[PDB]
Amino acid sequence: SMSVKKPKRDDSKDLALCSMILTEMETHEDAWPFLLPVNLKLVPGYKKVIKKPMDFSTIREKLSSGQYPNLETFALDVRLVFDNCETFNEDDSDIGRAGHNMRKYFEKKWTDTFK
């Protein structure tokens, strides 16, 4: 509350460390469904169903231009990529499996770097 604060966690490396995670996600062999925005002209149903599209290149641009206020808003966009994937793709498909694999890969790096 006013004039009463928990000890200050050092967040000075968060930007660099999120960049590193994102580089690791970009270079994973199962990243291909997520590297670029889904083409809303060429994929029937996507635009109406997926209210907030997200992909790795859009997170990279947001990260590089100071559009994440803190490391949690960064994690929320990464998770959105996988939540969108699950919304639109059957679990038993190449893309559905890719999304589960990448979400696991992310959540481990996230815990190991920050928890």
Curated annotation (Swiss-Prot):
Expressed at varying levels in several tissues, whereas a smaller transcript was expressed specifically in testis. It is found in: Nucleus. Transmembrane segments: none annotated. Residues 9-113 form the Bromo domain. It comes from the Eukaryota. Belongs to the WAL family. Component of the BRF-1 ISWI chromatin remodeling complex, at least composed of SMARCA1 and BAZ2B, which regulates the spacing of histone octamers on the DNA template to facilitate access to DNA. Within the BRF-1 ISWI chromatin remodeling complex interacts with SMARCA1; the interaction is direct. Component of the BRF-5 ISWI chromatin remodeling complex, at least composed of SMARCA5/SNF2H and BAZ2B, which regulates the spacing of histone octamers on the DNA template to facilitate access to DNA. Regulatory subunit of the ATP-dependent BRF-1 and BRF-5 ISWI chromatin remodeling complexes, which form ordered nucleosome arrays on chromatin and facilitate access to DNA during DNA-templated processes such as DNA replication, transcription, and repair. Both complexes regulate the spacing of nucleosomes along the chromatin and have the ability to slide mononucleosomes to the center of a DNA template. The BRF-1 ISWI chromatin remodeling complex has a lower ATP hydrolysis rate than the BRF-5 ISWI chromatin remodeling complex. This is Bromodomain adjacent to zinc finger domain protein 2B. The lineage of its organism: Eukaryota, Metazoa, Chordata, Craniata, Vertebrata. The chain holds residues 2054 to 2166 of 2168 of the full protein.
